[PDB]
Coordinates of N, CA and C and ligand atoms in Angstrom, one line a residue:
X1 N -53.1 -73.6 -22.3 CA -53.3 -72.4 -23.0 C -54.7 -72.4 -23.6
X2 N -55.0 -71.1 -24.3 CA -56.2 -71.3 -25.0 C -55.9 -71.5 -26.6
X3 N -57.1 -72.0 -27.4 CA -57.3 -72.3 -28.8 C -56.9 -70.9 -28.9
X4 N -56.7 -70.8 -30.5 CA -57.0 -69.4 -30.8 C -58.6 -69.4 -31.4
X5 N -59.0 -68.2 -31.4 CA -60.6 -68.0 -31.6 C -60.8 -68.3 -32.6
X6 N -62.4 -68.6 -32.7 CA -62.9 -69.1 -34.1 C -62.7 -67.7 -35.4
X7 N -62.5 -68.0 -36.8 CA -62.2 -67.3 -37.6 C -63.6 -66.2 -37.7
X8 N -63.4 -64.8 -37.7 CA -64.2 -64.0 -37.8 C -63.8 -63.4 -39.4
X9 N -62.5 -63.2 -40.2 CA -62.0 -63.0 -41.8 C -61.0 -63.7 -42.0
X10 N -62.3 -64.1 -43.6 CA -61.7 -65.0 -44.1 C -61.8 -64.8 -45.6
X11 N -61.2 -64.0 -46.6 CA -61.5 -63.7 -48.0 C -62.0 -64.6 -48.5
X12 N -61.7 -66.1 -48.6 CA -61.5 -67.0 -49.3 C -63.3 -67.0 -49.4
X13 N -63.7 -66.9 -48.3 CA -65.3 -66.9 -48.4 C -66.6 -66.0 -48.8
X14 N -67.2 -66.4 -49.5 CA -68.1 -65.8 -50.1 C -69.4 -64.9 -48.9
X15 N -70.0 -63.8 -49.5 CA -70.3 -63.1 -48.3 C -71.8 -62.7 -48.7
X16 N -72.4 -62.8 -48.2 CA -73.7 -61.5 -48.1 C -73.9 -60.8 -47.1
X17 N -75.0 -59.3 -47.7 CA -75.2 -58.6 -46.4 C -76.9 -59.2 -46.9
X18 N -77.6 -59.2 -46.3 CA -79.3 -59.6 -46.6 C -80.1 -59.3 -44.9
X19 N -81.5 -59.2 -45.4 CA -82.1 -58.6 -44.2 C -82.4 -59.8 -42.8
X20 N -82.1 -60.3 -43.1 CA -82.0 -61.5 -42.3 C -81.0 -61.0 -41.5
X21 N -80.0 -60.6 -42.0 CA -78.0 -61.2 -41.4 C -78.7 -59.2 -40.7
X22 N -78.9 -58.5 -41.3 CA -79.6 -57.0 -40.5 C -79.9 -57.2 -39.6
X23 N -81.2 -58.1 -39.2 CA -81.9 -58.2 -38.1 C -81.1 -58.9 -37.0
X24 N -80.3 -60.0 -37.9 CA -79.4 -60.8 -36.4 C -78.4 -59.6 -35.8
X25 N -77.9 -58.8 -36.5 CA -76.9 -57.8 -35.9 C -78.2 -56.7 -34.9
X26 N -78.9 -55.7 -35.5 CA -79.7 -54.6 -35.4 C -80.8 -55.4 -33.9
X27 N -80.9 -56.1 -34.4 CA -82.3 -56.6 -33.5 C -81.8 -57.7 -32.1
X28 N -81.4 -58.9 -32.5 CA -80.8 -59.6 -32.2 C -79.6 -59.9 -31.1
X29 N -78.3 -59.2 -31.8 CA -77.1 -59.4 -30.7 C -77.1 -58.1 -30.3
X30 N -77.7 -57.4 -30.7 CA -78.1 -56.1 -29.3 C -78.6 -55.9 -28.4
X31 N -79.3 -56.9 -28.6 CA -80.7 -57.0 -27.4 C -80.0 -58.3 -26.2
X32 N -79.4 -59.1 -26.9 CA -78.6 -59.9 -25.7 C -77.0 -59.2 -25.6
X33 N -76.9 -58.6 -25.8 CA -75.4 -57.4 -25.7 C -75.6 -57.1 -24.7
X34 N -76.6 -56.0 -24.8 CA -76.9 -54.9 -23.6 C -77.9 -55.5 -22.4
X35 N -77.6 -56.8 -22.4 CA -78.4 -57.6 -21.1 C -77.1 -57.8 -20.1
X36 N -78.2 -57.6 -18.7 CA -77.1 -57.6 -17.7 C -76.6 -59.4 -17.5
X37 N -76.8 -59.8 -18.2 CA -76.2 -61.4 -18.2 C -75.4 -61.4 -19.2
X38 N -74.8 -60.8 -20.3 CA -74.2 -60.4 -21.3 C -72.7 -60.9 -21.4
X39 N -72.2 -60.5 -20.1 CA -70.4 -60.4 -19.9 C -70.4 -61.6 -19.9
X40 N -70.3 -62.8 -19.4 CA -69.8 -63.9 -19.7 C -69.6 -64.7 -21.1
X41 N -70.4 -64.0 -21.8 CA -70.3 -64.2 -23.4 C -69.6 -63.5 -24.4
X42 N -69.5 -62.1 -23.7 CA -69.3 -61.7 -24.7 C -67.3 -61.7 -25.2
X43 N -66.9 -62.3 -25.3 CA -65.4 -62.6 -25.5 C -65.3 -64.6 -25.5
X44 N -64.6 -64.9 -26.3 CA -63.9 -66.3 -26.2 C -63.7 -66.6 -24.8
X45 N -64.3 -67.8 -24.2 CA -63.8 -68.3 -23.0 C -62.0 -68.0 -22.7
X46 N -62.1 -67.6 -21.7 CA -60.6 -67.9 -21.4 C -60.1 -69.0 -20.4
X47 N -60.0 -70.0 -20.5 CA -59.4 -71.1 -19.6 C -58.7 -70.7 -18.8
X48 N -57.6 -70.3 -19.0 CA -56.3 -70.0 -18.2 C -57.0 -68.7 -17.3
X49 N -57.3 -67.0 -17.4 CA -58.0 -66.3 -16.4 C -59.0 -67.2 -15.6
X50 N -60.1 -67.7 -16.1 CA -61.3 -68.4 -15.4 C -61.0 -70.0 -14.8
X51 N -59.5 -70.5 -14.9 CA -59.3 -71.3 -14.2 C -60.2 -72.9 -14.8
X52 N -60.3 -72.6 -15.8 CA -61.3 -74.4 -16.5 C -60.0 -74.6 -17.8
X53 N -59.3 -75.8 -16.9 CA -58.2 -76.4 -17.2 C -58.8 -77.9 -18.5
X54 N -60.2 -77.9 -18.1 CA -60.7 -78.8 -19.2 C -61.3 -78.2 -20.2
X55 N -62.0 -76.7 -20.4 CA -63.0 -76.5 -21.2 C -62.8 -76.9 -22.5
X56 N -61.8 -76.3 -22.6 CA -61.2 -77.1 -24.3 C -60.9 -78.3 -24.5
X57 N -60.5 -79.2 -23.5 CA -60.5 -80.6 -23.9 C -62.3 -80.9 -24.2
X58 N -63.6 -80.4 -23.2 CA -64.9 -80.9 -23.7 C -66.1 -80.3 -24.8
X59 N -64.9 -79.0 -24.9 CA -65.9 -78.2 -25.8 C -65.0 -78.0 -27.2
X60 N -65.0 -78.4 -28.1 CA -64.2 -78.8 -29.3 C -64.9 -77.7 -30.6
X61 N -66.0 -76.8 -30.5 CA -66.9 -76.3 -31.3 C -66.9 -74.7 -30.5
X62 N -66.0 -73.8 -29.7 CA -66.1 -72.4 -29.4 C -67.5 -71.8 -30.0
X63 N -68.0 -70.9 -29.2 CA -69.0 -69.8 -29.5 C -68.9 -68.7 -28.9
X64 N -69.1 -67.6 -29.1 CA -69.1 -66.7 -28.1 C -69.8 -65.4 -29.1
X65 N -70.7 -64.4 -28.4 CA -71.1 -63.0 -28.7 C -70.0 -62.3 -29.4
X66 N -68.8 -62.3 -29.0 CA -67.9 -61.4 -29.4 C -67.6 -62.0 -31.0
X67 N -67.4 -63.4 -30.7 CA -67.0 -63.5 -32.2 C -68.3 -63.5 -33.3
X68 N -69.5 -63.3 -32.8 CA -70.7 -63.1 -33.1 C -71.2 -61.7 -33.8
X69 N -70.3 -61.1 -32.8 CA -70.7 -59.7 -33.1 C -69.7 -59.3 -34.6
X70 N -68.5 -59.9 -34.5 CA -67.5 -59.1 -35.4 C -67.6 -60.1 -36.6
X71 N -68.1 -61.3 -36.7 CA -69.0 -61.8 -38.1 C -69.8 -61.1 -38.8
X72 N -71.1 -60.5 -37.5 CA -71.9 -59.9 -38.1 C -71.2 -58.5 -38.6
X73 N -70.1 -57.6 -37.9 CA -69.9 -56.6 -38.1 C -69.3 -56.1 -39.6
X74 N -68.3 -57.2 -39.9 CA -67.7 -57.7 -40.8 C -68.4 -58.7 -42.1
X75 N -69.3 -58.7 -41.8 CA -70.2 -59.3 -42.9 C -69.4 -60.9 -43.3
X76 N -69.1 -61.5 -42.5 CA -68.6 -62.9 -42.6 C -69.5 -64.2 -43.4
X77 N -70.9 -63.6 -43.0 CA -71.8 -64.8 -43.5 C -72.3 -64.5 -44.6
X78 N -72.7 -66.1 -44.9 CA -73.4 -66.1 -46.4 C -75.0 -66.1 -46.1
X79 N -75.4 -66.6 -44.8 CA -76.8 -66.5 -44.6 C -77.3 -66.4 -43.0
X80 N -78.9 -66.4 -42.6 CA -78.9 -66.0 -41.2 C -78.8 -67.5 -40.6
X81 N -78.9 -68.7 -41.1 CA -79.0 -69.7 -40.2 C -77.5 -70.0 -39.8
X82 N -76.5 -69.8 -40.4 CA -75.3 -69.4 -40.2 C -74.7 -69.1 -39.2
X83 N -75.5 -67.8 -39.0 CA -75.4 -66.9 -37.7 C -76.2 -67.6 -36.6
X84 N -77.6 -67.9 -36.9 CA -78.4 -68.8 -36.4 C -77.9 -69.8 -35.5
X85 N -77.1 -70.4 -36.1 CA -76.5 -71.9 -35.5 C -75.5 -71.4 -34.5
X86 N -74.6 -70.3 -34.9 CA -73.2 -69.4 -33.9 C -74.2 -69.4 -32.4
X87 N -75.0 -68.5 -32.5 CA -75.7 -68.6 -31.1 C -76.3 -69.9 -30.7
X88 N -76.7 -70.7 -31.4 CA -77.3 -71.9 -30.4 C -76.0 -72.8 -30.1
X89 N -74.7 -72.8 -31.0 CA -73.6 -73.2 -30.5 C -73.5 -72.9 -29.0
X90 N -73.3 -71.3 -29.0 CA -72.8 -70.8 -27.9 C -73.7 -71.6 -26.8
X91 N -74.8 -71.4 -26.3 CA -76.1 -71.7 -25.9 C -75.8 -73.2 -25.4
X92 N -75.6 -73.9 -26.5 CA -75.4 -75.5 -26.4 C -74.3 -75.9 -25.6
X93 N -73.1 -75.2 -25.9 CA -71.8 -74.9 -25.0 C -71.9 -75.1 -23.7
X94 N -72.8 -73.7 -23.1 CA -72.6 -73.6 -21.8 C -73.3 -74.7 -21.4
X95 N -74.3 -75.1 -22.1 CA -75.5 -76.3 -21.4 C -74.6 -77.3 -20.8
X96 N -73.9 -77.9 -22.0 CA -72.7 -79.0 -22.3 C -71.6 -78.9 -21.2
X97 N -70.9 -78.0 -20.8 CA -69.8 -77.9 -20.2 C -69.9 -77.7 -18.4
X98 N -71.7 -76.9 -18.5 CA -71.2 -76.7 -16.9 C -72.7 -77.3 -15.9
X99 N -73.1 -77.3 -15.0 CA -74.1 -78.2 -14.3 C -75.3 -77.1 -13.8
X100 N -76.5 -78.0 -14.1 CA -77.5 -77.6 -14.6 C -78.1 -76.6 -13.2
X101 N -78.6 -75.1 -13.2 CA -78.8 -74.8 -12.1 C -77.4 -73.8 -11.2
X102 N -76.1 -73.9 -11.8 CA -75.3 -72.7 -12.0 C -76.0 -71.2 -12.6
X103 N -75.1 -70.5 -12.0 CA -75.6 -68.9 -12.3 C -75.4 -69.3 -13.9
X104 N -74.2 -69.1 -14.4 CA -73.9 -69.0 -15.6 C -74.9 -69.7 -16.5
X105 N -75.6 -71.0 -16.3 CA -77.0 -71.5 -17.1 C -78.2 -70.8 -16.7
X106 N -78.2 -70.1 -15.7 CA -79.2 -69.6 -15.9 C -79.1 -68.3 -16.2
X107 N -78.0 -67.7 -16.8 CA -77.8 -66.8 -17.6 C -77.7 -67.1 -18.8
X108 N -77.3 -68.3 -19.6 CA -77.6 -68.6 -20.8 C -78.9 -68.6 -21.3
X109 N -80.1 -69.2 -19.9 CA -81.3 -69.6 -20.2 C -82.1 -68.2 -20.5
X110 N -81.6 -67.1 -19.7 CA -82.3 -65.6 -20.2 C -81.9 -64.9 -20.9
X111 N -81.0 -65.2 -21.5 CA -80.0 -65.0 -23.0 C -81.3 -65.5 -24.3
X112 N -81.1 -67.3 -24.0 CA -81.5 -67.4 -25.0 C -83.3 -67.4 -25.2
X113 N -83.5 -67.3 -24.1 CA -85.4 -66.9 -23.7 C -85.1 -65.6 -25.2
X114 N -84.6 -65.1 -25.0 CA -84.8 -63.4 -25.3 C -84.4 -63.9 -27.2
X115 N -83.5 -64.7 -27.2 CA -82.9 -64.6 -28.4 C -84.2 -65.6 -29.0
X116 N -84.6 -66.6 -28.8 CA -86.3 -67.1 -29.3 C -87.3 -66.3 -29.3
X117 N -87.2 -65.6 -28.8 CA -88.1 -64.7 -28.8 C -88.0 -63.7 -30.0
X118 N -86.7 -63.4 -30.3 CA -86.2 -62.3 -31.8 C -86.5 -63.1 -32.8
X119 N -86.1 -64.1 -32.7 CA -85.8 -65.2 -34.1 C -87.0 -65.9 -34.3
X120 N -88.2 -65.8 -33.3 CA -89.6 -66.4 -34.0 C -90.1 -64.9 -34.9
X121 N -89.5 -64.1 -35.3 CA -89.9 -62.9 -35.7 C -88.9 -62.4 -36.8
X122 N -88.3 -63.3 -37.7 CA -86.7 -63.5 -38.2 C -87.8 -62.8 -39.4
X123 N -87.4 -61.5 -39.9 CA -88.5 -61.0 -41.4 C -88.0 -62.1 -42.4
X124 N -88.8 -62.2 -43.4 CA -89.0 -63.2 -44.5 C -87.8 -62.7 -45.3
X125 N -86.9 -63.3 -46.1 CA -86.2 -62.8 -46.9 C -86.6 -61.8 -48.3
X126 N -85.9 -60.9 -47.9 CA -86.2 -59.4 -49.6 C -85.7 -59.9 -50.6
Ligands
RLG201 C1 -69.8 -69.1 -21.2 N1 -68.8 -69.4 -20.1 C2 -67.8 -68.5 -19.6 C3 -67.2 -69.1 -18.3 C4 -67.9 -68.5 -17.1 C5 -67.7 -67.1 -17.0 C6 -68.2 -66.4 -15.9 C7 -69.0 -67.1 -15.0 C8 -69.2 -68.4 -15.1 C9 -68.6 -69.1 -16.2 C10 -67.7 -70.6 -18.5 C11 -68.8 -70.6 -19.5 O1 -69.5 -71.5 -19.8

């Protein structure tokens, strides 16, 4: 079966909205959203549909755009490196799990080209 997904609400936690956590939503998971390499990310792995009977035994740390998006949408974080870390999880993930020179890494790799690219440009905090 699959885990259930990483927590997107959670009361118990303290929250900010700041221009940082703006930019990763507005600028950021839009720009790798609406990329035609997008779909593989954007939802929790599914083991059981996609047939990876181990992913969850080697991947113990989930990432995915979807739950990325509905952090950001929902104002989950307290800061951008937060969010920061969610995508290089994700990123680190696929590196970790599958062999180097697959489509799917080299969809991560123009994923995250694009997403270094945003985040050398992260505005200064207001
Ligand atoms: C990020 N994902 C999703 C899974 C997948 C989906 C579609 C094509 C290839 C691989 C495995 C993986 O690392």
């Amino acid at each position: 079966s699959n885990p259930p997904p990483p927590e997107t609400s959670n009361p118990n936690k303290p929250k900010r909205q700041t221009n940082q956590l703006q930019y990763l939503l507005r600028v950021v998971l839009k720009t790798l959203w609406k990329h035609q390499f997008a779909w593989p990310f954007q939802q929790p792995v599914d083991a059981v549909k996609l047939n990876l009977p181990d992913y969850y035994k080697i991947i113990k740390t989930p990432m995915d755009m979807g739950t990325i998006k509905k952090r950001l949408e929902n104002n989950y974080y307290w800061n951008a490196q937060e969010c920061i870390q969610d995508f290089n999880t994700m990123f680190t993930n696929c590196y970790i799990y599958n062999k180097p020179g697959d489509d799917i890494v080299l969809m991560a790799e123009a994923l995250e080209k694009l997403f270094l690219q945003k985040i050398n440009e992260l505005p200064t905090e207001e």
